[PDB]
XYZ file of C-alpha atoms in Angstrom:
291
model
C -7.953 -8.588 -21.789
C -7.336 -12.308 -22.741
C -5.229 -13.339 -25.571
C -6.029 -17.040 -25.770
C -8.647 -18.947 -27.870
C -9.814 -21.736 -25.690
C -12.388 -23.158 -28.126
C -12.457 -26.497 -29.635
C -12.546 -26.342 -33.449
C -15.742 -27.548 -35.168
C -15.970 -27.913 -38.921
C -18.834 -28.353 -41.471
C -18.647 -28.860 -45.191
C -20.919 -26.690 -47.242
C -20.741 -26.028 -51.040
C -17.589 -28.146 -51.346
C -15.509 -26.376 -48.631
C -15.002 -26.671 -44.814
C -16.071 -23.812 -42.508
C -14.661 -23.569 -38.969
C -16.806 -22.521 -36.069
C -16.876 -22.105 -32.274
C -19.832 -23.981 -30.634
C -20.074 -23.755 -26.874
C -22.594 -23.361 -24.190
C -25.869 -25.333 -23.980
C -26.445 -27.894 -26.737
C -29.991 -26.663 -27.434
C -32.299 -23.686 -27.042
C -32.128 -20.421 -29.043
C -28.399 -19.990 -30.131
C -26.563 -16.767 -30.316
C -24.810 -16.336 -33.641
C -21.652 -14.116 -33.743
C -20.590 -12.733 -37.046
C -17.225 -10.987 -37.591
C -16.135 -8.718 -40.411
C -12.929 -7.511 -42.050
C -10.085 -8.556 -41.494
C -11.048 -10.547 -38.474
C -12.392 -14.054 -37.387
C -14.078 -15.735 -34.526
C -10.959 -14.697 -32.541
C -12.600 -11.245 -32.313
C -15.444 -12.664 -30.088
C -13.023 -14.636 -27.741
C -13.527 -12.444 -24.691
C -17.261 -11.787 -25.206
C -18.489 -15.345 -25.681
C -17.566 -16.385 -22.111
C -20.083 -13.970 -20.673
C -22.858 -15.540 -22.901
C -22.098 -19.274 -22.897
C -23.139 -19.777 -19.305
C -26.812 -19.186 -20.511
C -27.019 -19.753 -24.282
C -25.392 -21.776 -27.015
C -22.847 -19.611 -28.809
C -21.999 -20.204 -32.516
C -19.328 -18.161 -34.139
C -18.248 -19.156 -37.743
C -15.126 -17.979 -39.527
C -16.415 -16.495 -42.952
C -15.376 -18.456 -46.112
C -11.714 -17.559 -46.957
C -10.993 -16.295 -43.424
C -9.935 -17.570 -39.998
C -9.607 -21.449 -40.058
C -12.218 -21.930 -42.883
C -11.070 -23.207 -46.250
C -9.802 -20.947 -49.035
C -11.592 -21.557 -52.442
C -10.509 -19.431 -55.342
C -13.244 -17.100 -55.368
C -13.436 -13.247 -56.069
C -15.072 -13.075 -52.571
C -17.858 -10.654 -53.329
C -20.389 -10.083 -50.685
C -22.678 -12.406 -52.672
C -20.209 -15.302 -52.263
C -20.199 -14.668 -48.392
C -24.020 -14.658 -48.487
C -24.143 -18.045 -50.248
C -21.711 -19.674 -47.810
C -23.236 -18.239 -44.655
C -26.732 -19.267 -45.849
C -25.660 -22.725 -46.316
C -23.698 -22.847 -42.923
C -26.848 -21.788 -41.098
C -29.063 -24.481 -42.772
C -26.357 -27.281 -42.322
C -26.425 -26.560 -38.552
C -30.159 -26.817 -38.487
C -30.782 -23.569 -36.901
C -34.318 -22.295 -36.644
C -34.612 -19.045 -34.524
C -31.559 -17.128 -33.544
C -30.126 -14.083 -31.715
C -27.606 -12.077 -33.800
C -24.349 -10.373 -32.583
C -22.862 -8.656 -35.507
C -20.144 -6.240 -36.589
C -18.920 -4.742 -39.987
C -19.332 -7.142 -42.793
C -20.902 -9.556 -40.367
C -23.503 -7.042 -39.752
C -24.287 -6.693 -43.582
C -24.598 -10.493 -43.660
C -26.754 -10.573 -40.447
C -29.113 -7.702 -41.419
C -29.591 -9.175 -44.928
C -30.284 -12.572 -43.562
C -32.746 -11.167 -40.943
C -34.631 -9.111 -43.665
C -35.072 -12.385 -45.578
C -35.948 -14.498 -42.525
C -37.609 -12.079 -40.062
C -39.665 -14.732 -38.255
C -36.272 -16.479 -37.296
C -34.762 -13.457 -35.535
C -35.340 -13.015 -31.819
C -32.926 -10.016 -31.290
C -29.976 -8.330 -32.817
C -26.948 -6.859 -30.883
C -24.828 -4.748 -33.243
C -21.973 -2.339 -33.246
C -19.922 -0.486 -35.950
C -22.373 -1.729 -38.599
C -22.722 -1.111 -42.283
C -25.176 1.509 -43.601
C -25.287 3.387 -46.946
C -22.598 6.076 -46.754
C -23.706 9.103 -48.926
C -20.429 10.979 -49.338
C -16.712 10.628 -48.331
C -17.380 13.595 -46.069
C -18.905 11.344 -43.588
C -15.958 9.064 -43.275
C -13.550 10.252 -40.361
C -10.466 12.252 -41.494
C -7.871 9.921 -39.938
C -8.983 7.084 -42.170
C -10.605 8.713 -45.227
C -7.696 9.102 -47.812
C -6.524 5.457 -46.924
C -9.943 4.081 -47.698
C -10.047 6.070 -50.952
C -6.692 4.406 -51.794
C -8.114 0.953 -50.987
C -10.734 1.452 -53.630
C -8.522 3.138 -56.404
C -6.219 0.331 -59.303
C -3.335 -0.518 -59.089
C -2.851 1.173 -55.477
C -5.391 -0.649 -53.285
C -4.169 -4.107 -54.155
C -0.511 -3.011 -53.499
C -1.499 -1.814 -50.054
C -3.832 -4.660 -49.004
C -2.484 -7.672 -50.971
C 1.218 -6.920 -51.216
C 1.834 -4.974 -47.989
C -1.064 -6.496 -45.859
C -2.162 -2.967 -44.764
C -5.615 -4.112 -43.498
C -3.882 -6.424 -40.971
C -0.790 -4.481 -40.034
C -2.335 -1.002 -40.322
C -6.126 -0.690 -40.148
C -6.718 -3.365 -37.529
C -4.540 -1.989 -34.702
C -4.918 1.678 -35.580
C -8.725 1.081 -35.029
C -8.363 -0.236 -31.481
C -7.605 2.438 -28.919
C -5.534 0.246 -26.482
C -2.506 -1.402 -28.025
C -3.014 -4.875 -29.676
C 0.013 -7.105 -28.639
C 2.070 -9.350 -30.787
C 0.415 -12.697 -29.768
C -2.967 -11.144 -30.688
C -1.643 -9.768 -33.881
C -0.260 -13.247 -34.767
C -3.707 -14.803 -34.293
C -5.016 -12.290 -36.740
C -2.049 -12.714 -39.130
C -2.292 -16.555 -39.362
C -4.980 -16.889 -42.202
C -3.180 -14.426 -44.451
C 0.483 -15.402 -44.253
C 0.393 -16.132 -47.971
C -0.302 -12.846 -50.044
C -2.581 -14.529 -52.574
C -5.002 -15.562 -49.677
C -5.558 -11.886 -49.026
C -8.275 -11.387 -51.700
C -11.151 -10.992 -49.381
C -9.446 -8.299 -47.437
C -9.232 -6.203 -50.620
C -12.647 -7.036 -52.067
C -14.512 -6.040 -48.853
C -13.583 -2.333 -48.754
C -14.384 -2.268 -52.496
C -17.918 -3.495 -51.599
C -18.701 -0.701 -48.947
C -21.670 1.220 -50.253
C -20.258 4.817 -50.665
C -21.824 7.511 -52.922
C -23.912 4.984 -54.768
C -21.330 2.334 -55.613
C -21.253 -0.543 -55.991
C -24.978 -0.324 -56.945
C -25.947 -3.817 -55.975
C -24.696 -3.461 -52.439
C -26.278 -0.067 -52.069
C -29.579 -1.573 -53.124
C -29.418 -4.456 -50.580
C -28.157 -2.339 -47.733
C -30.823 0.280 -48.227
C -33.375 -2.597 -48.085
C -32.218 -3.990 -44.793
C -32.142 -0.415 -43.324
C -35.750 0.084 -44.367
C -36.580 -3.308 -42.728
C -34.713 -2.335 -39.596
C -36.354 1.159 -39.185
C -39.916 -0.563 -39.312
C -39.186 -3.710 -37.373
C -40.105 -4.329 -33.795
C -37.264 -6.843 -33.215
C -35.376 -6.011 -29.988
C -31.973 -4.318 -30.749
C -28.927 -3.549 -28.629
C -26.340 -1.063 -30.036
C -22.847 -0.716 -28.598
C -20.895 2.464 -29.522
C -17.628 4.088 -28.710
C -16.031 7.532 -28.797
C -15.019 8.623 -31.399
C -16.159 5.484 -33.217
C -15.489 5.090 -37.038
C -18.716 3.995 -38.784
C -21.001 4.977 -35.982
C -19.800 8.110 -34.182
C -21.509 9.118 -30.906
C -23.973 11.611 -32.584
C -25.056 8.918 -34.992
C -25.537 6.272 -32.149
C -27.840 8.765 -30.384
C -29.857 9.318 -33.598
C -30.152 5.514 -34.130
C -31.418 5.068 -30.551
C -34.393 7.135 -31.738
C -34.827 6.052 -35.455
C -34.698 2.305 -34.692
C -37.622 0.651 -32.781
C -37.006 -1.061 -29.420
C -33.384 -0.130 -29.469
C -31.179 0.113 -26.240
C -27.841 1.816 -26.662
C -24.659 1.047 -24.501
C -21.580 3.422 -24.332
C -18.471 1.415 -24.116
C -16.120 4.264 -23.527
C -13.113 4.958 -25.850
C -13.298 2.985 -29.021
C -12.816 3.224 -32.823
C -13.878 0.315 -34.948
C -12.947 -2.999 -33.318
C -14.937 -2.236 -30.108
C -14.599 -5.893 -28.925
C -10.894 -5.197 -28.423
C -11.417 -2.177 -26.194
C -14.269 -3.215 -23.933
C -15.126 -6.944 -24.321
C -16.459 -7.378 -20.841
C -19.120 -4.705 -20.931
C -20.194 -5.857 -24.317
C -20.429 -9.589 -23.239
C -22.068 -8.699 -19.785
C -24.645 -6.421 -21.336
C -25.568 -8.959 -24.053
C -25.999 -11.521 -21.211
C -28.154 -9.086 -19.093
C -30.295 -8.302 -22.272
C -31.008 -11.921 -23.328
C -33.434 -12.842 -20.672
C -35.887 -10.037 -21.629
C -36.237 -11.852 -25.128
C -37.726 -15.038 -23.591
């Protein structure tokens, strides 16, 4: 599994700030837009993009406050991310797109798709965000930690002071061991504690047992859209998974129209770090059927 990031940096200024993005493959045609989540960046897609770039333009932005993008002093609510990604997409002049999304990138991708359905040709997803009714549904190995992330005083000590989302959550949610050079790529944007605000606001925005209400409402809305939309869907899942365990992937294969599922083998949350080649090769095999 490759540890390098051989992509030339591209930057675009939107709403006063620069956003970094990978842009490879053909210069035109339908682009494939890769959206990462918490606490990652376009680095998470580095071994998947090479399977797709031979046929399609691949664009992978670093969300505002993350990766190589600038760091405005925001509270970094999901709504701030929505504003920046909406502006990024229009600044690049994108018309129709194929989405490849994960975690908070999936909440951004699905919410953008529900609002711009005529512009989405297909959605490839994995370990995505859905309304979580109770903590019972959260797996035991990670439940008490995520509860601490959402409690005062404690969640900020863990995520901002101790960097628990980078040093703990990230590697503990990859089955194979991440190496120090990979961990340093993920650590780079957050070397200064104050720059870790997005890492703490994100878990506090997850819709669980009804809160926060605004996010629950918007996630319910895109789920209803997804269950009634004929857009082609490709869902990758692992065992035991975290947000989408095996039993839930099988149920979604049924409850979502035109949905193909792919078993990646062992995996927790950052599936891209356990089987990037199967994820990339299957996306490449699936794209021509969208023509």
